[PDB]
Design an enzyme around this catalytic site. Sequence first.
Site, PDB file in Angstrom:
ATOM      1  CG  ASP A 247      -2.270  -0.687   0.863  1.00 34.06           C
ATOM      2  OD1 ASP A 247      -2.706  -0.627  -0.325  1.00 34.06           O
ATOM      3  OD2 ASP A 247      -2.852  -1.290   1.813  1.00 34.06           O
TER       4      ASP A 247
HETATM    5 MN    MN Z   1      -2.526  -4.145   4.929  1.00 29.28          MN
END
Ligand code: MN
EC number: 2.7.7.6
Lengths: 133, 98, 114, 223, 112, 65, 56, 266, 43, 56, 279, 59, 84
Positions: free
Chosen positions: K21
């Site tokens: 992410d």
């Molecule tokens: Mn995660």
Amino acid sequence: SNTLFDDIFQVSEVDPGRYNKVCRIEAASTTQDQCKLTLDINVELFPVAAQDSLTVTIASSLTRSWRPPQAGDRSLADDYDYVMYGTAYKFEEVSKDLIAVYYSFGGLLMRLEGNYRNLNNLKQENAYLLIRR
Amino acid sequence: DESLGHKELKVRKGHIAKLMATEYQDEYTWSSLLNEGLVEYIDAEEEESILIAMQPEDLEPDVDPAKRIRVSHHATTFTHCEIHPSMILGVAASIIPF
Amino acid sequence: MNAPDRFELFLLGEGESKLKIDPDTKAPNAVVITFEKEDHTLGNLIRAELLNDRKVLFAAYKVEHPFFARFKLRIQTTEGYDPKDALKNACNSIINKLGALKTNFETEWNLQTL
Amino acid sequence: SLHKMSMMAHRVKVIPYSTFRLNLSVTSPYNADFDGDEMNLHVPQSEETRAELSQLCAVPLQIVSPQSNKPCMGIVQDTLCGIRKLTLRDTFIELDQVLNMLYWVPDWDGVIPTPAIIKPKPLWSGKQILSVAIPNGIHLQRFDEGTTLLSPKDNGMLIIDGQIIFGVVEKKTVGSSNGGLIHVVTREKGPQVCAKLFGNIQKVVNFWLLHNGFSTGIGDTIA
Amino acid sequence: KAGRLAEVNLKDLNNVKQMVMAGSKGSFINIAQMSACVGQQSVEGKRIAFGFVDRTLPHFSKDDYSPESKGFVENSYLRGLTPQEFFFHAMGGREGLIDTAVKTAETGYIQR
Amino acid sequence: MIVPVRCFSCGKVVGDKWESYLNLLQEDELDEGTALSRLGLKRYCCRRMILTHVDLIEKFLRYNP
Amino acid sequence: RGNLMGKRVDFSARTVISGDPNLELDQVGVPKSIAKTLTYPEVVTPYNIDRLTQLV
Amino acid sequence: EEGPQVKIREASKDNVDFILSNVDLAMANSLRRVMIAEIPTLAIDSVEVETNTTVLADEFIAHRLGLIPLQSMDIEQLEYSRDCFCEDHCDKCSVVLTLQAFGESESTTNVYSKDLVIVSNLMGRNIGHPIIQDKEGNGVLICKLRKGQELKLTCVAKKGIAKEHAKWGPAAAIEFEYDPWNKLKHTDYWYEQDSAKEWPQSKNCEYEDPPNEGDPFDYKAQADTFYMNVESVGSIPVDQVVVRGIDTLQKKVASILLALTQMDQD
Amino acid sequence: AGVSQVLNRYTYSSTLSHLRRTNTPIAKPRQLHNTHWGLVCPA
Amino acid sequence: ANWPLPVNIRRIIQNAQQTFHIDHTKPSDLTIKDIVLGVKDLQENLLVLRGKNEII
Amino acid sequence: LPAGQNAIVAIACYSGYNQEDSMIMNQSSIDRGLFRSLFFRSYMDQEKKYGMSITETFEKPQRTNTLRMKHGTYDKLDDDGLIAPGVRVSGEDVIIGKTTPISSKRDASTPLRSTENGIVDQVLVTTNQDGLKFVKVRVRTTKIPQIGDKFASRHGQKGTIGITYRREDMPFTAEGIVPDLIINPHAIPSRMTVAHLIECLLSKVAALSGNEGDASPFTDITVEGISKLLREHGYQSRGFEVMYNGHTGKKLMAQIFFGPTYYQRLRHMVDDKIHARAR
Amino acid sequence: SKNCYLSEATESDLYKLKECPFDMGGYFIINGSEKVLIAQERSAGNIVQVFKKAAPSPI
Amino acid sequence: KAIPKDQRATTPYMTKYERARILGTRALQISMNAPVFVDLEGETDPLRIAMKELAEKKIPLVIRRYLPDGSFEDWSVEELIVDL
Ligand SMILES: [Mn+2]
Ligand SMILES: [Mn+2]
Ligand SMILES: [Zn+2]
Ligand SMILES: [Zn+2]
């Protein structure tokens, strides 16, 4: 200074199985019904087709870092086209009466089956693989 | 109370084109639609006692393999149909694509 | 604020050279060079020229971190072949190849109408 | 921080822009991702307090964790995906790129491995170079459903003296799993030498992945 | 059996499956819901309950016990969900987050 | 606000092509798809520039000071 | 109890984390600016007199 | 002329769509990088905001100014402020533009790079002229003024590399490709049923022979022949981007050969 | 109670959203319920 | 069959067989007494507890 | 009044810097303005409550008998005790220079927030209903997407900028287009976030075709239809694009799902959360 | 709302008032800060409702 | 309460916590210029020297292991097998 194995082989099958550059060759032996070969080969660099015949020399010479040309002008111990170089992970199986021997060419595997290679073959890494035609 | 087809929406391409006449003219109104008994207001309570079509085309009396699989239109009992089901969402969710 | 001034990418701040030359220890006839304020632009170039040269046994380069503008270059050349000379040589080899291109281009550029 | 493993000690490495920077593999010990997680860094202040950190809590000392008698840090995300790819039999490396991959592994000894294919083109296995991230003295045998010593499906796993002899390297081997290569390297060769292994493997595989490329589209999700 | 039917299909090129083979994020249920059927929604471990009298939405008839009615999402996420499927999925979803908030809060305190 | 001068992605000077696009639209009654290709914006990276753009300035120049 | 609950958080620093495939497994990239904020009391010692002096 | 060989397909004031041939991918890229990266160029890099009652904020304005491409033909005939021995900026290292605009009409006064005026002595070098490529002499639309809103600016164009800030970039896109027919098998084409039937053929499949299905994979065949295409932003004539690309690359290696030399001595 | 809140103004839609926000002080009230269909956003 | 235990014995052996280049071809130079007594003797050496008394 | 921009987004494992992410943002794109934002913090300060001639004075203080001031410099306040528009303010610079005699010069004043630094946008002086003197200072700051800044597509997945590469290094498409934004494919299967892909697919067609892409829920639009349209536009219909590693120029072995996708830039920016209170 | 000036206001009547014409306005200005009364959800009155009661209860 | 050099039931091996703490304590000395016992074959850093002193069995410390009953065993860092 050596040569270990020598024979021309009779390719019963060539498995591409999920791969694209690699095939699993299961050649029989010209001469002895005992001798068999199972081998992974980079088809892209040397095609192999069913019912073919392969002169399969093992050998083990001609580890320090590796050199590209210069010795390609000279020590051309490659009177062959295909020249893998593998490690003996040889499980000398003691399989019944025959003697099966194993090689890893960086994950391309090779498994011979016979009996007379006790004083023929290495149990150790250094062991090239040669195939002419 | 529509005679021609079957059960059909009281709104007609006619009404809509009146609405859009008024759009372009920036007078047929939402209020109009309510007055002329085309659109109703339904609270959850009343919602109990009706049968609502999802898409108008669920009134209508091979299939795309790309398309989703939508339920049958087994009822001539519809009392209402949804304006558009994507209007079940609030604001925040109304921004989410697909 | 932490962001280093963008010039630091192509401009040498103080005390830094262009090249630091280190004598690779692990192997014979090999050298590690650190280019400061260069990047792949040069790295991948010099390496794949260095690599053509046959009396070069080993050429590789790496930029160990995207943050910093610098890269290391390792050349292992044959016994009696100096890597600095192999560099020099592969460097020239480039300058000459670009001269050609510069020419060939300005040439083929003029023949064009527009 | 519910977990001795989520308070670990690291070596500082001052860097440019803001944000702390973590090695990806130290990720799940912390149950951290990078979608906005803040972390606290705390500077041990006294010398014994230093010593304690780096002698007990130091991240390498935390690879094999008490919690499930396994490693708790594995190879992950890209480096995992990449390693599988890099490891397939069909993965071969042209000399030009071998030298980099090689040079990328800092613990490389400078010997260019003699290619597993020397014939028409000097051509290394994907395995061969990964096998240079692995240090010597490392062996691993595992067998899957249909592994043999010829492991058709390039199944299972055999590594001998730090050359993966066969098997696709993925979670089983190179992840945090029980028998895996990290467990092995940790016990067999020391925590630090294992910790350095993550580095090598990542660096090699990541370098490899960067020039190979991995993606996923809607096409991947169509039957 | 729907979900398997797509996991076997997807080629060894398949980027999704390519992550799945390696081990990095991605389980069967994932491929399963994206590609084949999303599957049955459920709240308090039951099919969607008759919130309206003897029917789950005002869009079904009374006493409709079919999968479609009682909350089977037939479609993959790739295919998109019908409004009912969408709302039933939303129902199951809200169950998830609600007691994902419970599991976080109780677990938080158990651990302490 | 106003046209970005250059397409973010690559840096085509895009901010010299906004009035002309508004023309390609209104006075020449063209559609954005055809119009954008005429201004030369051929890669979607530069198209999304003009086509996505919201000219809020023409609403800012409506307040007094 | 106010000091038994961990309030006066000293020699610590907090920021977004980002992953970085180029740090060793046991590294933590500290931004320079955060590095410049957190101190370590190091005792001046013939082994370190120059380095410390260089810093000062 | 032995070695790298250009083979131009289109040429315009904007484009150079050519074909590099007989070069290492390395080099072909290296130049591709240089063009996007390190061709020096002139660009407003400091704005002094005198009056701005416009609706945009100063730094907003300031930003865009910097983004307006300027004349960089004679940029070698200009020194980077940083090396120029002056103090800040002078005609040796810096062009000095002005933007004065007042919302005069009750209609919306638009403002353009055209309204930029060089206020320093250029000493004859083609430099710092707001590049206008539009068909009505306006160029980049800097700001919009309502009646009664003023904009008084002093810009300073300094010599920079796109690496320093992508505003100094003479290139726009740089198309770049090799092996249109995937003959080096440098890619493994993703597909649902048919590699061939799904991927559209490239521009440059036409310029190259489709492989013969019977053939062995040519293992020895390296990558040469790179179909590039430089788009210019206007600050420098395309032909010149490609050149200075090849030029600045040449200077770089030269900067190194001199370092290996001056690495000795004292 | 906190019935009156400061109007969100981060983002146009976030303001919009705020004005259509609802609160339910204090059996299973957080569960999205069938009868919510088309009156409350399920998302 | 499979239970979390300390010391991976399989591995140690796999290390022996590699550290000594043991060939599965020539007969081993072990005595039975070597093994049988050696291991019997080894067990007496695995010490979690050290008290000399009987209970311990 | 849109909130976000169309990022040219590549779903790729790239340098390794977009794992778990993060995102690799295109630094060049940033330079040309992508995701820049104004940020107006406006501060407010009043004059005295009920104190019998205990007023608070907006004026320049320079220490007399209490000296109680703050470390920020007053060098910036005018002689009315207010920075006038235009003046760049940073550090902990004083903005509303206020003073209070308590029972001569006890400084109570609003300095600029520690982590912050901007330029004054508008100082505003008013009157209440109790007639109290009001000052409102708007302090403008331009915020440039850095490492750490948080960005979310429209499908409940945020992610920060891990690193920004310049256009040189980004992996580029045959077309010379290069992504503003590289996300990681491992973010995909486990979220089941197919919308992101289909929007991306659509967003591409849309950009190519000028036609606004209807991504409304419960339309009859289809990945298969959107595919067909992209295909007509001469791109491979499932979004992928052969791409060239920026460092080397060599092709990427795999093809990279490439497309515009509406990304939102979210607040709580790195610089606001670097708080490092070593003491 | 009916009672506010903006209710009648033209588009320009808004820009002149320095009120974003886009503003929507279900809110109050209160000591300068815009307040929203969040719709409070109660049960209805006048509604009969039976409830079973747990086994411990005597009812 | 003390337990004689014979009849020590405690590990002959140094515990990871002990090492952690010797090295700590020892470095804290080395750091304040207290005199070092080994040859500093290069090292400048205290802990690294402390470790070198431990390595060459030259740390002059006794660890006092307390048993839960209160009695204790004394071991000399010299005696203690460092194998971790
Ligand atoms: Mn995660
Ligand atoms: Mn997170
Ligand atoms: Zn563009
Ligand atoms: Zn000057």
